[PDB]
Amino acid sequence: EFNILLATDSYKVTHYKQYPPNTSKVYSYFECREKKYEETVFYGLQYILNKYLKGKVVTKEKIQEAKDVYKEHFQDDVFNEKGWNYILEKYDGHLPIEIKAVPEGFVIPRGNVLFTVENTDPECYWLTNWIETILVQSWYPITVATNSREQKKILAKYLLETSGNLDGLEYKLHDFGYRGVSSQETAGIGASAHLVNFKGTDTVAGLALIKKYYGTKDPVPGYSVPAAEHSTITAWGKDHEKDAFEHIVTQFSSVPVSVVSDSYDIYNACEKIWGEDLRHLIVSRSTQAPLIIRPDSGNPLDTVLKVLEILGKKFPVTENSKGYKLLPPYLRVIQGDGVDINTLQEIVEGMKQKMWSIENIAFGSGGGLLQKLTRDLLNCSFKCSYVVTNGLGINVFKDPVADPNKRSKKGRLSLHRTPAGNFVTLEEGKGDLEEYGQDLLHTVFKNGKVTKSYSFDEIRKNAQLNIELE
């Protein structure tokens, strides 16, 4: 079972002995520090508050366990047993911490305070940064949600340009990342973050996470369709690819079905198998049940363009009202290999140049969407900005000589709307001067309880694109 006393960076176990004597308050904050990604989607803190921080998180057993582990880990007795015992005895193991945060789903420019953390009992001055490690992992859902939204911006731009509307946008980027992430827990968190922006996912783990921690009016937040993988095509044998295709599209004759078509020769599969031998089984399909052809190898752009040219010559193509080519409604393509924010851009631009509507194509992304991201991408960072020692408040910060980008904010922080309606973070307690109206941060956690929460429906609304709002 999870033990918050064993869920911190080792060195933090020794920090209670390093702060100035008579420190009664440590106040810290999280930002995506300014340094391609000008704004960030704030998402994921609510998961962490509920799963890890709320309620009785300290017990006699957990304290003894941590004591025993750290004794060996440090080869010395440095663990603050008395400190954790105080929390157990005084607060029935509930953390005397207050956390204020921007609403989940909010889209906020870089370099703004997103959440703050401080102890509510002077004895627990050390607790604020103990939980840095747990809270900082919010970088991951933030970064997934943000990068996923940036890809939605690209898709919206090109879909609107080539078709004149945004129909189906929320299904244009499917999550294929389940196998390509580092753990089951990561799969659920990352998939949930993608679902802030889109509705298509194969990472089933995200559904239960959203249901438990956020909630939606709909039964599920995300959807999928039947689809083949290489094993279900190749199992039929090298000479029986056509047989596999026929079996699969006949089994799934009245729902959409994706079929990976590159097992041996994608171009042959498209031109001869789909385009000639099985063509009669494709042109009979409903608009609600298209065949989705899935290439999965080769240069992503070149392959998509060639697949489209092949299909364009075997199937009846129309020209939509914007002048772009459109496959018949029973036939679509999905590119789910080598897709990341950069290649996504390359492919839609290349399609546009060849006069193919973005209506024709959908994308899937795996490692690119959920794994190939780090804390450095948005410079997600947690720092102390204010302490009280001997009853006097001190504005504190770091400001390394060789890297001005790592300079942290000073003092008590608040988030405000500017006269032009933008965000500003006030430092040094200046929010108190009341020149900038009310603090936009909300208290979300206080003394062991979650004090404010958001449904996944609210989060999605907050995270909408301006082009969707317009």
Q: Which of 202, 262, 337, 427 binds ligand 2ZM (CB under 6 A)?
A: 202
Residues in binding contact with ligand 2ZM, number by CB under 6 A = 14
Pick one of its own copies, ligand 2ZM, none as the site partner of residue 14 (Cβ within 5 to 8 A by kind): its own copies
Q: How far is the CB of 376 from ligand 2ZM (least distance, A)?
A: 18
Does 50 interact with its own copies (rule: CB under 8 A)?
Answer: no
Quick one: CA dihedral 295, 300, 302, 304, positive or negative? Answer: positive
CB 258 within 8 A of CB 292: yes
Q: How far is the CB of 181 from ligand 2ZM (least distance, A)?
A: 15
Build a one-symbol-per-residue string for 433-462: x at contacts with its own copies by CB under 8 A, - elsewhere. Answer: ------------------------------
DSSP 8-state symbol, 102: P
Which residues, numbered 267-286, are part of the site for its own copies (CB under 8 A)?
267-268
Pick one of ligand 2ZM, its own copies, none as the site partner of residue 419 (Cβ within 5 to 8 A by kind): none
Write the CB contacts of 454 (distance below 8 Å, at least 6 apart in sequence). 46, 103, 104, 105, 214, 462
In whole angstroms, give the CA distance from residue 462 to residue 199: 16
Q: Which of 43, 106, 178, 356 binds its own copies (CB under 8 A)?
A: 178
CB 373 within 8 A of CB 396: no
Q: Which of 129, 147, 163, 357 binds its own copies (CB under 8 A)?
A: 129
Write the CB contacts of 194 (distance below 8 Å, at least 6 apart in sequence). 144, 145, 148, 173, 175, 177, 201, 203, 206, 369, 370
215, burial (CB in 10 Å: exposed 0-12, middle 13-18, buried 19+):
middle
434, burial (CB in 10 Å: exposed 0-12, middle 13-18, buried 19+):
exposed
In whole angstroms, give the CA distance from residue 268 to residue 306: 11
**Annotated binding residues, as ranges?**
179, 202, 230, 294-296, 336-337, 367, 375
Between the two ends of the chain, the Cα-to-Cα distance in Å is 48
Build a one-symbol-per-residue string for 366-395: x at contacts with its own copies by CB under 8 A, - elsewhere. Answer: xx---xxxxxx-----xxx--x-x----x-
Pick one of ligand 2ZM, its own copies, none as the site partner of residue 206 (Cβ within 5 to 8 A by kind): none
Does 334 interact with ligand 2ZM (rule: CB under 6 A)?
Answer: yes
Does 2 interact with ligand 2ZM (rule: CB under 6 A)?
Answer: no
CA distances from 87 to 97, 120, 186, 458 (A): 11, 12, 30, 34
Does 167 interact with its own copies (rule: CB under 8 A)?
Answer: no
Does 24 interact with its own copies (rule: CB under 8 A)?
Answer: no
80, burial (CB in 10 Å: exposed 0-12, middle 13-18, buried 19+):
buried
Q: Which of 1, 11, 36, 77 binds ligand 2ZM (CB under 6 A)?
A: 11
Q: Which of 3, 23, 120, 224 binds ligand 2ZM (CB under 6 A)?
A: 224
Q: How far is the CB of 440 from ligand 2ZM (least distance, A)?
A: 34
CB 214 within 8 A of CB 46: yes
Quick one: CA dihedral 164, 258, 335, 261, positive or negative? Answer: negative
Pick one of ligand 2ZM, its own copies, none as the site partner of residue 334 (Cβ within 5 to 8 A by kind): ligand 2ZM
Task: Report how far Cα 466 is from the mean position of its chain's Cα atoms.
Answer: 19
Does 8 interact with ligand 2ZM (rule: CB under 6 A)?
Answer: no
CA distances from 31 to 41, 109, 112, 244, 403 (A): 12, 10, 6, 52, 17
Q: How far is the CB of 402 from its own copies (least distance, A)?
A: 3
Angle of helix 341-353 versus helix 300-314 axis, rounded to 10:
40
Closest CB to ligand 2ZM among residues 14, 447: 14
75, burial (CB in 10 Å: exposed 0-12, middle 13-18, buried 19+):
exposed
Q: How far is the CB of 28 from ligand 2ZM (least distance, A)?
A: 17
**Annotated binding residues for diphosphate, as ranges?**
179, 230, 294
Ramachandran angles phi, psi of 288, nearest 5°: -85, -5
Q: How far is the CB of 254 from its own copies (least distance, A)?
A: 9
Which residues, numbered 269-308, are part of the site for ligand 2ZM (CB under 6 A)?
292, 294
Build a one-symbol-per-residue string for 203-222: x at contacts with its own copies by CB under 8 A, - elsewhere. Answer: xxx-xx---------xxx-x
Does 147 interact with its own copies (rule: CB under 8 A)?
Answer: no
For tokens 């690819």, what's the residue?
A: 241
Build a one-symbol-per-residue string for 226-265: x at contacts with its own copies by CB under 8 A, - elsewhere. Answer: xxxxxxx-xxxxx-x--xx--xx--xx--x--x---xxxx
Which residues, numbered 88-117, are part of the site for its own copies (CB under 8 A)?
none
Point out which residues bind ligand 2ZM (CB under 6 A): 9, 11, 174, 200, 202, 224-225, 227, 258, 292, 294, 334, 362, 364
